[PDB]
């Protein structure tokens, strides 16, 4: 329930 | 009306000048509401709109943590990208990301977004289905295969259909007096002789929100797209936007020209002439 997790390209 | 929430993230390497800078800015429509900058003295998710300030200390603490983790993930990405393109460690490179959700008047998901650009070129994007990727080139195909193996699209779909839309609905309710208020443009037409033969007519739109506007000149009811100078919509610094459109007209023919303005704030479209 917070801003978005990113994944490594 | 329809609304959007979008995070705009920039990571930029700087060999010899430390680790890559990460900046993330969040927007609801054309209103910034958060910023994170890895170069800030004490990096924190910081409020940039008044209706966000109420959120409470755990909002700030965990968002700060997600941004600090995202800093590291974008640095990992920049290392990988340099490799995928066989680039030297000498150059500066940029990774940009756009992600978030659009909702209709009833708050229902219209569509989600999760896309990336490397050195200003589209690299990979989540398709509108939220299940599959479009890769620009054979480097982005490596990222696509990795993300397929790790079922990343599933995680992104759950964020965009759940958390993203739920936070946007709460922000729209908390900021309803500003985020749900369209401010119409204030309009006038100016006249400047350029020579004995010609004058510039300039159609002004000031003080409007949101930024989306249509400003055209017509001559005898025909659109003058080719002969109009249209400046980019620009921020005033008080939340509102400005724009102008100009045409060069033969002296004496000014009344054949009409400026037309469409904007969400107007009760109806405007038709303006000089005087």
């Amino acid at each position: 329930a917070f801003a978005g997790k990113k994944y490594c390209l | 009306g329809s609304h959007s929430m979008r995070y705009f993230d920039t990571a930029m390497s700087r060999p010899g000048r430390g680790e890559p800078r990460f900046i993330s800015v969040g927007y609801v429509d054309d209103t910034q509401f958060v910023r994170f900058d890895s170069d800030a003295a004490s990096p924190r998710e910081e409020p940039r709109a008044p209706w966000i300030e109420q959120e409470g200390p755990e909002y700030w603490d965990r968002n700060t943590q997600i941004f600090k983790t995202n800093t590291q993930t974008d640095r990992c990405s920049l290392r990988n990208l340099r490799g995928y393109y066989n680039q030297s460690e000498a150059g500066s490179h940029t990774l940009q990301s756009m992600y978030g959700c659009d909702v209709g008047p009833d708050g229902r998901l219209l569509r989600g977004h999760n896309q990336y650009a490397y050195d200003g070129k589209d690299y990979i994007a989540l398709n509108e289905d939220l299940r599959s990727w479009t890769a620009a080139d054979t480097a982005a195909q490596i990222t696509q295969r990795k993300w397929e193996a790790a079922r990343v699209a599933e995680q992104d779909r759950a964020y965009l259909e759940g958390t993203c839309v739920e936070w946007l609905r709460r922000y729209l309710e908390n900021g309803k007096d500003t985020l749900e208020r369209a401010d119409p443009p204030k309009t006038h037409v100016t006249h400047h002789p350029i020579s004995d033969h010609e004058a510039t007519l300039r159609c002004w739109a000031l003080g409007f929100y949101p930024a989306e506007i249509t400003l055209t000149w017509q001559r005898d009811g025909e659109d003058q797209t080719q002969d109009t100078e249209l400046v980019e919509t620009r921020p005033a610094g008080d939340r509102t936007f400005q724009k102008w459109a100009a045409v060069v007209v033969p002296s004496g023919e000014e009344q054949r020209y009409t400026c037309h303005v469409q904007h969400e704030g107007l009760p109806k479209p405007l038709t303006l002439r000089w005087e």
């Binding site: - | 920039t10 910034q32 200003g120 070129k121 100016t190 300039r202 921020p235 005033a236 610094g237």
Partner: protein
Amino acid sequence: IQRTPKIQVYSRHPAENGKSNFLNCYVSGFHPSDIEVDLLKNGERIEKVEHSDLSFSKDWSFYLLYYTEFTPTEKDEYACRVNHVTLSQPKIVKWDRDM
């Protein structure tokens, strides 16, 4: 591949001689993001000019607003000076109250 900045110099409110206002330099459409922007009063750099947080348009080009408090007069000339990797020398755009 690099993209040169578009530059606009303007006031927040309609300009009235002797009335306090904000002088804006909006740079947009540029890539990469490093850019040097100065606001000038009769040729001289204004101190403690503020700017917006770096962001970009859906074509990935960057934009920034630089701004400062000012009181226009009939006498005082204002301008924006911009440097970018795409420019061989700084670009100066003069404040024109009808642009």
